[PDB]
Amino acid sequence: PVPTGGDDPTKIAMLGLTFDDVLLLPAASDVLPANADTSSQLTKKIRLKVPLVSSAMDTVTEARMAIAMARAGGMGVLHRNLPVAEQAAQVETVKRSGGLLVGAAVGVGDDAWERAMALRDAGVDVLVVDTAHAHNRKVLDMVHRLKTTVGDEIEVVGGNVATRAAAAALVEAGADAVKVGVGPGSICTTRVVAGVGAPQITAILEAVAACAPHGVPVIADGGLQYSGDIAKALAAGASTAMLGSLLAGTAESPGELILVNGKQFKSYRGMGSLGAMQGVPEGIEGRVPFRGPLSTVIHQLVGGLRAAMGYTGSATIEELQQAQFVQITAAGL
Amino acid sequence: PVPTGGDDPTKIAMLGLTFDDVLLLPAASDVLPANADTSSQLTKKIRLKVPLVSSAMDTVTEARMAIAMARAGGMGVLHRNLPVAEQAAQVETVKRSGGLLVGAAVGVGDDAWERAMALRDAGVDVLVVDTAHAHNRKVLDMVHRLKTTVGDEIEVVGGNVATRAAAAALVEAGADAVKVGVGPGSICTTRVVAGVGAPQITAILEAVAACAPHGVPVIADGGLQYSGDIAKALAAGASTAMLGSLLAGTAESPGELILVNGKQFKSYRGMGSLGAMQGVPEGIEGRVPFRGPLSTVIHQLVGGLRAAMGYTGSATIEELQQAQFVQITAAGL
Amino acid sequence: PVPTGGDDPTKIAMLGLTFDDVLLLPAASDVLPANADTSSQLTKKIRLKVPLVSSAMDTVTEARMAIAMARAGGMGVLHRNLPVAEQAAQVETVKRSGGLLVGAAVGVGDDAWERAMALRDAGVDVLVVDTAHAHNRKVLDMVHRLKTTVGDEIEVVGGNVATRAAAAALVEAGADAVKVGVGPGSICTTRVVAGVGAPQITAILEAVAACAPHGVPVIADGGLQYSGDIAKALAAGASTAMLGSLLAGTAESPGELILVNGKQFKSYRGMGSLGAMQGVPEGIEGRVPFRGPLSTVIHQLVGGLRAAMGYTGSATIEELQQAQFVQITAAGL
Amino acid sequence: PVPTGGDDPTKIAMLGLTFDDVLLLPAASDVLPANADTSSQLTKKIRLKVPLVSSAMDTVTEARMAIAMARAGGMGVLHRNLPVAEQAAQVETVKRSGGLLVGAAVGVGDDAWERAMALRDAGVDVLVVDTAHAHNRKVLDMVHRLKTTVGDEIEVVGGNVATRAAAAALVEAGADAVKVGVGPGSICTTRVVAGVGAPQITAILEAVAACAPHGVPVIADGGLQYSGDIAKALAAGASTAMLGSLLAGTAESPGELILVNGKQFKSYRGMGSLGAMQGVPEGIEGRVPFRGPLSTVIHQLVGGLRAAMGYTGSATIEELQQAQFVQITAAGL
């Protein structure tokens, strides 16, 4: 029998590693952190100066965040937990601040096609078909319909996935980028409520195995707690990282300051939390420390990435994606 | 020598995984959580609408719980820590509330045959031969005697086991279902007192390898803490889950509200605890948070299961039983 | 290269398991806990009714403990942190309480031969050559000298060891039992101070591989925290268990009651602690909860063992020594 | 696919062990701790009586520490976070206290060559080219330039490295010793900020595989918390250990006593901390317990090492470097 039980070796299909399971190995380097090139592909066509996108969540990204993110060289994805007219107006607001990149989330519900067309009319650059489970005909069909209808002017992202097969399906549907993350989010309770998930380093490695041969960038979404996690996600093969928790504490996120026991916080909640759905939960409502301006958070995050590129001899993100890991033990934390 | 010591490779026979060691992998799916079919076999003949049974414990299941459980589409197993006449009367009470399914525990002591016949007379549907260690001639003989005597009107469950061989023995004795769990219970101290046990995912996989080829359902009993654990136990191959801790906090369980430090609790104790035996302990007496009505707890539990069936593309429990896992590391919690 | 570094596969020689790493697997059984036979060989010649010996420590075993232990069916080993005359007088005191078995520790210092002869004269049954590191010519020579001089009337134990080779050396020197434990003691700081040790399940398996073929019993010494650990140590192949921590809280141990924050304690200290040596430390001075009479502690310990013998179908300790383990993961605790 | 994801087996290159992952196995021994020879090579030419060097940090080693360390039989490395004139004057101060060994850190910046020549003029014995990442042409060139210019009178150390290849590069550049440690320091945040590092036992094993064949000693730098860690680092093949945390609490380190909540502390900060750089941080500012005189700390540290040499039968450090480990599990701590 199989050492962990039963007679089927495929029952337990893999050993899933998360960020805390690995470290980047230093390598020969003539790259100074200050000189590394941090640009990377968000989608097949769109390159960002900084490989970071803010999550499509209503305690993270509305117009103010999208504007600050694009000015910092990344991009925001506007959340979709509001009327179609307001979302499109947020898109327009970002555009009124210059030639700034902006994305917007849509679902696959009755109302999604209308939403997508309104955002298109508003001048959106990227449409993110954004769902709990993208390995599904309705999601694949929406990705394909958008790519064939508005595809030559708008880039279309599909997510989220957690396996090589799911990512391959989005590639075949025409996705211009694939977003990876089922289970790892800081406010996510999918793992405890449904018992479902995939540790994020293994999920990225698997998705990249399906996406890289086709020139489709992977967006690592969820579970990033530290600047060093960004470096790890990219070295695992992702081209960008999507941040929720790390940006929800910033001045530019929606929400006000909360003072508890003399310290400053902001509210941060899952899109699957009770309160987000009353606008069986798979997300919580919580708080995160107030962090100040976005520009300052992004500076330290990018600083950590630059440090990693120095250590690994990576002049570009493309080079970082070829870096090697060491696996650590439980004693290692 | 063997890497862990000595010269015998069979000394340390396997690596045992528990619920926290695994996650369900998302898979291609056209199944909406709301549309999944949650029915499953309790025994060879009996199918439940909801794959959940309440434990035969005196702080969990008396008539009120059995009634609420059957109305929710599951079943209760009446505990046996009272006189034969009272247990049979509880059986009758459940039946007075309609054509509701109900089970009842018996042991293998002098008094067990009399108990079993009285419950039969009371109209019980399922008899559960329920013991700390079922891999034993007296237990096997009782299972067989019941199956040959009352077997065509009553289904007979045997438990508990933790190995492929033990489950195979119950199958050969005529069990209509096999119950798995030695060591994993929340109030169980078998692991620390006797040093005995089997991690529950590996125990289910092993028991299913013996039971499924013979069409005998496995009941996963003990160690379930979250709705996601129910999904994991079924995907490991079990057909139903038995709950103690998760239901002991409910309005319908025996026992009154306990107020400690401004919060509400109910008493929850092992059948092998001092107080359960004074009616060398292998169970504790504890408290669990008061949770309100059973209907509400079952709704969230079934909600979590439906979510898992959506993620895994499982239209039925039978399909869920073929789902795949990823193993996670210690960093994964 | 070797996956953990360097080019030498023998550098990291084995994966060491401790008690918490394993569980005993239930097996077919017709043995009732109440009926199991708990007797076992302390030495080649001496069998105990209960497979438990108290440590040769000055906060655990003086005459009162030795007397209580023998009456409970085990034995005490009198510590040697006092003058030769007092130790011998303690031996005599035990003998004045009937035909009770008693052992006594000696070292390998200048004074040890004199000590050994005085204890012999006092009527001691077992001499324990007791040292931090027995894999050493002076220890081997002392074991052999005693066996050739007083060996036909007194049994001679040697310890402590942690490897197959060390145990083999004591067997060749003539030891009648071998004591295993370098590093695992509750009050031991050898692991942090010297960086030396061996996880106790692997140490027992290795020592038994050297001792069992020669009919020499292994005494598992140190690291036992729960009654279930006793069962594990014996199933790993040991014939008896030596207890320090578990008995230091008892009425019969040396030392008085200590009241701290409304709860009762006794002092418990390593023989290598500062205070034991002032009569570079490798042991601490601590407290353990007061537990009451020895008889009560031994009853629960033996109760747990009986439970294990029931679960594993072990009618005798000899049978228990053939039981199988499952290895558990970090999530398993 | 590879069990942890993707199709490349080299992506995750190794399993990295840290000190807490291993223990030294006791071995046959005729070596008394008091009699072991603790001397070891700092560099190809320089042997120390005690295999310990103090870190080049401004809360650890200035003239007072360098003096105390050499008198204890080790050496100090003077930090370089001050003007060239003051560092050279510290070197001279040490020399005014007798024929004491002393080292000094230099970087690879514009000012480093001048620094190195001034320290040379001051009578320094060892120059340590000391950087976050030594696997780099500028570092290799500096090591080589120093070795060819002042190499016959001064020994030249290069660091830090974490891989076999990096250490091989320093050997080829002419290093007289190689210093190992990227990530493990107590005040280091490289792992969380950059996601970069190498567990220290595996890093030492790998570096030694490159250095030992060429007769170049390895200095184990960072992550040492206990005296037992020193023994482990040497048995892994290092010839000396560099200490920061363990010595920063001593009377001889720079800094004053800090009283917080009735207990005594000293400040201890990374050279990459904000405050060290304001003279994106990769080190913190913290406190360590005040420990008293250096002589006392070194005595217990050397005591622990002697204990390890006794247990492993190592008469010399060279013998200790051939000792074997056992790997432990997470339960092992």
Ligand SMILES: C[C@H](Oc1ccc(-c2cn(C)cn2)cc1)C(=O)Nc1ncc(-c2ccc(Br)cc2)[nH]1
């Ligand atoms: C609503 C609630 O919680 C959420 C909400 C949003 C996300 C989310 C992640 N991302 C990237 C974008 N949005 C995740 C969880 C929930 O339980 N959703 C849910 N659980 C299972 C399914 C399902 C699985 C198969 C199929 Br087919 C259809 C639905 N959906």
Ligand SMILES: C[C@H](Oc1ccc(-c2cn(C)cn2)cc1)C(=O)Nc1ncc(-c2ccc(Br)cc2)[nH]1
């Ligand atoms: C009474 C006490 O604690 C309990 C009580 C009930 C259960 C329990 C689980 N389940 C599913 C239904 N009931 C478990 C433990 C206890 O120690 N029992 C016990 N330990 C060993 C044996 C034994 C092992 C081999 C043989 Br053969 C006979 C008895 N029995």
Ligand SMILES: C[C@H](Oc1ccc(-c2cn(C)cn2)cc1)C(=O)Nc1ncc(-c2ccc(Br)cc2)[nH]1
């Ligand atoms: C005195 C201090 O602490 C102790 C004291 C007693 C025990 C102890 C266990 N047991 C079963 C019986 N007694 C263990 C540690 C200490 O450090 N002892 C020590 N550490 C290394 C050596 C050594 C190693 C090789 C050789 Br060869 C000679 C001595 N001795």
Ligand SMILES: C[C@H](Oc1ccc(-c2cn(C)cn2)cc1)C(=O)Nc1ncc(-c2ccc(Br)cc2)[nH]1
């Ligand atoms: C200044 C700050 O923090 C420090 C400061 C000193 C040390 C330190 C260790 N040791 C032994 C001696 N000094 C370590 C970290 C920092 O982030 N430094 C840094 N991170 C990446 C690079 C880099 C990587 C490739 C190349 Br090429 C050039 C620079 N440098």
Ligand SMILES: O=c1[nH]cnc2c1ncn2[C@@H]1O[C@H](COP(=O)(O)O)[C@@H](O)[C@H]1O
């Ligand atoms: O309610 C939820 N349940 C599960 N995942 C969520 C939920 N809400 C947002 N997310 C995901 O979690 C990511 C943020 O993760 P974080 O950066 O670790 O906080 C988002 O970008 C989404 O992919």
Ligand SMILES: O=c1[nH]cnc2c1ncn2[C@@H]1O[C@H](COP(=O)(O)O)[C@@H](O)[C@H]1O
């Ligand atoms: O005293 C005990 N010792 C060991 N297992 C028990 C005891 N009492 C009840 N159980 C088992 O534990 C299960 C409940 O586990 P739980 O749902 O994790 O709380 C029951 O259904 C029984 O199988």
Ligand SMILES: O=c1[nH]cnc2c1ncn2[C@@H]1O[C@H](COP(=O)(O)O)[C@@H](O)[C@H]1O
């Ligand atoms: O000071 C010490 N250092 C290391 N081991 C000790 C020391 N003192 C007693 N012991 C060992 O530890 C055992 C007790 O371990 P315990 O039962 O876990 O508390 C004794 O029987 C000795 O083998």
Ligand SMILES: O=c1[nH]cnc2c1ncn2[C@@H]1O[C@H](COP(=O)(O)O)[C@@H](O)[C@H]1O
């Ligand atoms: O700011 C820093 N970041 C990373 N490593 C540092 C820093 N400052 C000092 N070190 C390293 O950490 C070592 C001390 O580690 P410790 O002995 O564990 O405290 C030093 O000898 C340096 O190699």
